[PDB]
């Protein structure tokens, strides 16, 4: 047991150009996870968090994931999407979750959805929409950023089919470079542009929320296979730039801050993260394309 | 029951003029008989931080269901058998799990237990350094020894026994207070000057805030502010297109906005410029380091 545990939630920062009244923001509380038969495997101490969110005039959403102990399970979601009884069971359980606990809707956060299950995922989400909108509950989804349909691990996410059945699409537009890759910008503005351009040809613009990075990364250059970069917060990156007295430079092409330093063992490091200027540019491209919102992360200690 | 749970840790950013680091993993908590009440799956964390040539530390708290317990430390310190028992299972924890030492985070320590707290830490430094283990402590920031609710912390006595002092130099304005700077440079300088006169300079690490706060102005006593991260403050300012202003006296950024319900808000936080000023004052007074916060969700 530990009573210092951070509750992760995803929250919506509306495009300022767009604003008793219908709610303008949401908080997606992490997570509930699923069993292969479609049951909701766990429960949360969420009653206090739900009540507080409602009182603040913001919609509390339940996040539903395919998480296991070793991360997102490619197989557990597959067993659900291919058993019609199980995905009906999941649809009913999700409804039972939001009605009993008092959520205003959900956020489906299914990751590593296999490419063969792409139409089955859309169908599940259609079945979930029908059930939820009948009860007045909102349907939202977290998807990885897509620039085309040519990528295998992204092929399970049909943007046009998902955009047709969900109320809102949270596009997780980051991790173009990450802990298991070569150093580079986490969310380059060039790739965000391409992601938006691909999405606005498929989904109504008011359904689109651009999620910003949770993590920046610290890589050891001359990059080595097998090694994992350090996943650090944006403030952590600034904190490391101070300790090593490294100047914070800014890529013009990428609109992303970066710096390099040498540690107490001679090893050169390269850090890419997000600052105030880069985050401004992301709200700017949201406003440029008349999109719904920027989405971001908060940690609440309870 | 929850796969996404954020592990808080306090880590050390060395004064670059001194060119080793540590990470204090939160927490274990204490029973009134001096027992360690909980277990953590930390063996993977301990190993990963040892791997990066940084010292892992076990954070020991007086934490309960509803925050920090004055009562629990009041009963451990006053009873000699319980406090010797605590020293014992702290050492056993450090030795068996493979920690490089300890961080005492005992909060709301009563004024009457001042010297008894100093003695307990003395008794623990003995036992720890015999095994070659570091003793660190997290203390609330003092600018004097006068205000009675935090006079259970003898800065001079604590400084002579511990290896390093982590001064929590923030929350001069907090959730239950009037709007203002979380960690103004004026109160930081006063804290430092009070501390260095009584404590060796190389033992002093000044902690920076974890949260900034969002108050609805015309402030009404009884309500609570929204505790937000420093990035959350930036994000809130983009949403409401509020310009970020910087107080030169407090060396602390702030902004104001109107929400959708017509209420006016005042937000104080920490940015890049205010953070740099904190490292600058660390370097000015030749202190050990800045201490900050990491969040690891797994």
CATH of domain A217-273: 3.10.50.10
Q: How far apart are CA B132 and CA B59, in angstroms?
A: 17
Q: How far apart are CA B105 and CA B69, in angstroms?
A: 12
Subunit contact B238:A301, Cβ cutoff 8 A: no
> Chain A closest CA to B181's CA: distance in Å?
18
Residue with tokens 């283990």: B133
> Chain B closest CA to A147's CA: distance in Å?
26
> Chain B closest CA to A98's CA: distance in Å?
17
B contacts of A13 (beta carbons < 8 Å)? 235-236, 238-239
Question: CA of A58: which chain B residue's CA is closest?
Answer: B260
Q: Is B232 on the interface with A (CB under 8 A)?
A: yes
Which residue out of B13, B239, B274 would a mutagenesis test of the A interface target, given it has the greatest number of A Cβ atoms within 10 Å?
B239
Q: Under a CB-based contact definition with an 8 Å cutoff, are residues A27 and A46 in contact? A: no
DSSP state for residue A213 in the 8-state scheme: P
Which CA distances in Å does A120 have to A76, A157, A160, B233?
14, 10, 14, 40
Q: Which two tokens stand for residue A100?
A: 């009993």
Which residue out of A1, A2, A11 would a mutagenesis test of the B interface target, given it has the greatest number of B Cβ atoms within 10 Å?
A2
Q: Under a CB-based contact definition with an 8 Å cutoff, are residues A175 and A154 in contact? A: no
Which distant-in-sequence residues (6+ apart) come within 8 Å of A238 by Cβ? Answer: A248, A273, A275, B272, B275
Q: Which of residues 77-136 of B touch A (CB under 8 A)?
A: none
Q: How far apart are CA A285 and CA A175, in angstroms?
A: 18
A contacts of B275 (beta carbons < 8 Å)? 238-239, 242
Exposure on the CB side of residue A116, measured as CA atoms within 13 A: 7
CATH of domain B213-269: 3.10.50.10
A contacts of B16 (beta carbons < 8 Å)? 243-245
Q: How far apart are CA B73 and CA A117, in angstroms?
A: 57
- Angle formed at CA A10 by CA A7 and CA A13, multiple of 5 degrees: 135
Subunit contact B239:A16, Cβ cutoff 8 A: yes
A contacts of B19 (beta carbons < 8 Å)? 264
For B231, which of A4, A234, A248 is closest by C-beta distance? A234
- Tell me whether residue A208 is exposed, middle or buried, using C-beta atoms within 10 angstroms of its C-beta: 0 to 12, 13 to 18, 19 or more: buried
Which CA distances in Å does A179 have to A44, A84, A302?
29, 37, 29
Subunit contact B290:A264, Cβ cutoff 8 A: no
> Kind and range of the H or E element at B193?
helix B185-196
Which distant-in-sequence residues (6+ apart) come within 8 Å of B277 by Cβ? Answer: B185, B251
B181 φ, ψ to 5°?
Answer: -60, 135
> Chain B closest CA to A116's CA: distance in Å?
27
Resolution in angstroms, to 1 decimal, for this deposition? Answer: 2.2
B56 φ, ψ to 5°?
Answer: -80, 135
Q: Under a CB-based contact definition with an 8 Å cutoff, are residues B211 and B173 in contact? A: no
Which residue out of B225, B235, B270 would a mutagenesis test of the A interface target, given it has the greatest number of A Cβ atoms within 10 Å?
B235
Q: Which of residues 21-60 of B touch A (CB under 8 A)?
A: 26-27, 29, 37-40, 52-53
DSSP per position, A110-155: --S--GGGHHHHHHHHHHHHHHHHHTT-EEEEEEE--S-S--GGGT
> Chain A closest CA to B45's CA: distance in Å?
13
Domain ranges of chain B: 1-212+270-298, 213-269
For B295, which of A6, A43, A283 is closest by C-beta distance? A6
Give the domain B1-212+270-298 fold.
TIM Barrel (3.20.20)
Q: Under a CB-based contact definition with an 8 Å cutoff, are residues B220 and B181 in contact? A: no
Q: Is A267 on the interface with B (CB under 8 A)?
A: no
Q: Which two tokens stand for residue A104?
A: 């205003």
Subunit contact B8:A13, Cβ cutoff 8 A: no
Q: For residue B166, which of B132, B189, B134, B140 has the smallest C-alpha distance?
A: B140
Q: Under a CB-based contact definition with an 8 Å cutoff, are residues A137 and A168 in contact? A: no
Subunit contact B276:A242, Cβ cutoff 8 A: yes
Q: Under a CB-based contact definition with an 8 Å cutoff, are residues A6 and A299 in contact? A: yes
Q: Which two tokens stand for residue B32?
A: 């009134």
| Breaks (C–N over 2.5 Å) after residues, chain B | 19
Which CA distances in Å does B79 have to A175, B102, B123?
54, 22, 14
Subunit contact A7:B6, Cβ cutoff 8 A: yes
Neighbour order of strands in the sheet with B252-258:
B226-228, B212-216, B264-268, B252-258, B245-247
Question: CA of A14: which chain B residue's CA is closest?
Answer: B239
Subunit contact B234:A276, Cβ cutoff 8 A: yes
Q: Under a CB-based contact definition with an 8 Å cutoff, are residues A276 and B47 in contact? A: no
Q: At what angle do helices B185-196 and B272-284 cross, to 10 degrees?
A: 20
B213-269 matches B1-212+270-298 in CATH topology: no
**Number of helices followed by number of strands (H, E) in chain A:** 8, 15
Which CA distances in Å does A272 have to A13, A21, A136, A239, A255?
23, 40, 42, 13, 11
> Chain A closest CA to B79's CA: distance in Å?
26
Q: For residue A80, which of A52, A117, A28 has the smallest C-alpha distance?
A: A117
> Kind and range of the H or E element at B258?
strand B252-258
Q: How far apart are CA A42 and CA B43, in angstroms?
A: 25
For B16, which of A5, A243, A275 is closest by C-beta distance? A243
Answer yes or no: B235 catalytic.
no
CATH architecture group of domain A1-216+274-302: Alpha-Beta Barrel (3.20)
Q: Which two tokens stand for residue A280?
A: 């401004």
3-state secondary structure A14-61: ECHHHCCCCCCCEEEEEEEEECCCCCECCCCCCHHHHHHHHHCCCEEE
Q: For residue A245, which of B14, B285, B16 has the smallest C-alpha distance?
A: B16
Q: Under a CB-based contact definition with an 8 Å cutoff, are residues A199 and A171 in contact? A: yes
């Amino acid at each position: 047991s530990n009573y210092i545990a951070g509750t992760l939630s995803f929250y919506v920062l509306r495009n300022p150009d767009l604003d008793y009244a219908p709610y303008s923001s949401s908080i997606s509380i992490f997570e509930y996870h699923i069993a292969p038969n479609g049951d909701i495997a766990n429960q949360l101490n969420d009653a206090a968090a739900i009540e507080t969110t409602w009182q603040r005039r913001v919609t509390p959403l339940a996040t539903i994931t395919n998480l296991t102990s070793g991360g997102f399970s490619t197989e557990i979601v597959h067993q659900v999407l291919n058993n019609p009884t199980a995905r009906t069971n999941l649809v009913n359980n999700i409804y039972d979750l939001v009605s009993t606990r008092g959520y205003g809707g959900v956020t489906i956060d299914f990751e590593q959805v296999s490419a063969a299950d792409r139409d089955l995922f859309t169908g599940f989400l259609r079945q979930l929409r029908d059930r939820l909108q009948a009860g007045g509950y909102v349907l939202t989804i977290a998807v990885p950023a897509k620039t085309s349909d040519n990528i295998p691990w992204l092929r399970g996410y049909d943007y046009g089919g998902i955009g047709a059945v969900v109320n809102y699409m949270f596009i997780m537009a980051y991790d173009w470079h990450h802990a298991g890759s070569e150093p580079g910008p986490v969310a380059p503005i060039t790739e965000i542009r391409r992601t938006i351009e691909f999405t606005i040809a498929q989904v109504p613009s008011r359904k689109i929320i651009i999620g910003v990075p949770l993590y920046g990364y610290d890589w050891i250059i001359p990059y080595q296979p097998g090694t994992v970069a350090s996943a650090i917060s944006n403030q952590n990156a600034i904190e490391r730039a101070m300790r090593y007295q490294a100047p914070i430079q800014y890529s013009a092409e990428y609109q992303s801050p970066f710096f390099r330093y040498s540690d107490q063992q001679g090893r050169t490091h390269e850090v890419w993260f997000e600052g105030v200027r880069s985050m401004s540019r992301k709200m700017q491209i949201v406003r440029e394309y008349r999109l719904q919102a920027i989405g971001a992360w908060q940690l609440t200690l309870a």
